Amino acid sequence: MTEYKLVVVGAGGVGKSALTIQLIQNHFVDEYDPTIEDSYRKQVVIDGETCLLDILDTAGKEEYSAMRDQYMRTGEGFLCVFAINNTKSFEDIHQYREQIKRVKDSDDVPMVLVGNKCDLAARTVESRQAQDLARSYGIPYIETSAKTRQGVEDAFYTLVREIRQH
Ligand SMILES: Nc1nc2c(ncn2[C@@H]2O[C@H](COP(=O)(O)OP(=O)(O)NP(=O)(O)O)[C@@H](O)[C@H]2O)c(=O)[nH]1
Ligand SMILES: [Ca+2]
Numbered sequence: 774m775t776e777y778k779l780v781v782v783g784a785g786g787v788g789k790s791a792l793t794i795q796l797i798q799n800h801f802v803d804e805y806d807p808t809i810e811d812s813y814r815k816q817v818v819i820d821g822e823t824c825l826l827d828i829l830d831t832a833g834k835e836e837y838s839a840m841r842d843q844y845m846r847t848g849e850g851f852l853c854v855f856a857i858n859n860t861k862s863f864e865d866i867h868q869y870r871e872q873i874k875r876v877k878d879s880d881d882v883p884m885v886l887v888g889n890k891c892d893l894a895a896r897t898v899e900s901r902q903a904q905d906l907a908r909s910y911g912i913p914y915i916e917t918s919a920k921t922r923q924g925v926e927d928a929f930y931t932l933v934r935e936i937r938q939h
């Protein structure tokens with residue numbers, strides 16, 4: 774059985790925990806409890822392969838990002854998440870890409886750009902704008918909703934498929 778270590782990063786409140794919990798536990802977390810560092814593990818069949826997913830849910834709030842670098846070190850793939858109704862979270866994606874490059878000491882790390890909360894209508898980040906950012910990094914852009922489940926499996930499974938190409 775193959776093991777894939779995934780790490781979810783991004784600004785505070787963009788929905789990292791809700792996305793992970795929807796994927797793993799199949800329910801939507803409506804409340805906002807800031808994360809320090811949590812991990813989830815689950816066996817799933819992806820494209821015919823039985824594998825073990827180890828997902829690290831990291832802190833987005835600066836005050837709670839103590840040794841985030843250390844926890845991310847073993848990550849093999851990263852979901853860089855921003856919220857489509859939070860322009861600042863989109864503009865700060867570069868901060869996370871930089872951190873990933875540092876922790877992995879590589880400019881070629883499996884990643885997927887995720888625009889979460891696509892169920893909301895106060896959109897300030899248009900799809901095309903995010904597609905362009907992802908293109909510059911040479912990675913896929915996928916929109917998700919931890920609330921409706923739209924694109925959730927697609928985002929995580931795509932990250933696995935990206936790890937498989939590296
Ligand atoms: N409508 C909607 N709300 C969402 C979505 N994802 C998350 N939220 C809401 O946004 C708030 C923060 O989500 P949460 O998953 O805790 O964010 P986080 O990125 O994990 N925050 P932190 O970095 O501090 O740990 C919660 O109230 C949650 O319900 C989504 O896709 N749609
Ligand atoms: Ca609570």
Ligand SMILES: [Mg+2]
Nearest residue numbers: 789790807808
């Ligand atoms: Mg969280």
Ligand SMILES: [Mg+2]
Nearest residue numbers: 897898899902
């Ligand atoms: Mg605009």
